[PDB]
From Swiss-Prot:
Further information: Enterobacteriaceae carrying this gene (identified by PCR) have been isolated in Sweden, India, Pakistan, Bangladesh, England, Scotland, Northern Ireland, Australia and the USA. The organisms they were identified in were K.pneumoniae, Enterobacter cloacae, E.coli, Proteus spp, Citrobacter freundii, Morganella morganii, Providencia spp and Klebsille oxytoca. In India most isolates were from community-acquired infections rather than hospital-acquired infections, indicating the gene is widespread in the environment.
Residues the entry annotates as binding Zn(2+) 1: H91, H93, H160
Cofactor note: Binds 2 Zn(2+) ions per subunit.
Name of the protein described by the UniProt record: Metallo-beta-lactamase type 2
Length: 241
């Protein structure tokens, strides 16, 4: 059993598949979890999403590595057995974009914030194939996100990074904050090295206001939580200013 140093532990309802863990969150939504092993420190878990939208699958975030991301595709083939149409990746860091080459090799169309694509090489990441742009209110420009089905992509402003984006799943209780949101019991906002400490709190609140209905808040390094994760993240961020 994988017991992360950072990230949620395995609980009942989790399925181990190769080096990864999968958890069903709703009839057509699963959380993928992958682990980066740091010698002398242990494993760091990272979470993304898998969405079945009719007859295709949509992915939110890669795993840490190409091989782990290929394992996600293999899990999809074995458990869902539908074509993977596209992926949205939520900023240019390894936990979110480390497996882009695996998606590209499989013929999967990839999308990221234009800024993520611009930062990608500087951050050691392969850029997505397509760039999302955003209105001043944070909502994705519709023509840059064609055929996204239930995915509602929102740029909340600079926080964890300047490029961080978020994704709601229409028809479900779920909104995904990626690395921007930490859980309601976290005492740290994680790595603030690339963070905007002035604007973080407003960005966390903007995420909450963009997806006001969502009751299940999914994030990169904790199990899904209530909206208290948003409130708590914003309150920790208030202390940075
Ligand atoms: C879990 C993290 C503390 S690390 C991760 C990310 N860092 C990486 O992907 C690094 N490439 C990395 C280096 C060494 C060990 C683990 C991750 C970041 O800086 O936002 N997201 C951070 C976060 O979400 O707070
Ligand atoms: O990250
Ligand atoms: Zn990051
Ligand atoms: Zn992270």
């Amino acid at each position: 059993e994988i017991r992360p140093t950072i990230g949620q532990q395995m609980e009942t309802g989790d399925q181990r598949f190769g080096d990864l863990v999968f958890r069903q969150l709703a009839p057509n939504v699963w959380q993928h979890t992958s682990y980066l092993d740091m010698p002398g420190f242990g494993a760091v878990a990272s979470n993304g999403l898998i969405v079945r939208d009719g007859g295709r699958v949509l992915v939110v975030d890669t795993a840490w590595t190409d091989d782990q991301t290929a394992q996600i595709l293999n899990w999809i083939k074995q458990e869902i057995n539908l074509p993977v149409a596209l992926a949205v990746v939520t900023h240019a860091h390894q936990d979110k974009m480390g497996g882009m080459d695996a998606l590209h090799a499989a013929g999967i169309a990839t999308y990221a914030n234009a800024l993520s694509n611009q930062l990608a090489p500087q951050e050691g990441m392969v850029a997505a194939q397509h760039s999302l742009t955003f209105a001043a209110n944070g909502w994705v420009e519709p023509a840059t996100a064609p055929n996204f089905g239930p995915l509602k992509v929102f740029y909340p402003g600079p926080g964890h990074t300047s490029d961080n984006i978020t994704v709601g799943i229409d028809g479900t209780d779920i909104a995904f904050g990626g690395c921007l949101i930490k859980d309601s019991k976290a005492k740290s906002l994680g790595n603030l090295g690339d963070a905007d400490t002035e604007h973080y709190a407003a960005s966390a609140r903007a995420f909450g206001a963009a997806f006001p209905k969502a009751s299940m808040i999914v994030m990169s390094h904790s199990a899904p939580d209530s909206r208290a994760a948003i409130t708590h993240t914003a309150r920790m961020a208030d202390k940075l200013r």
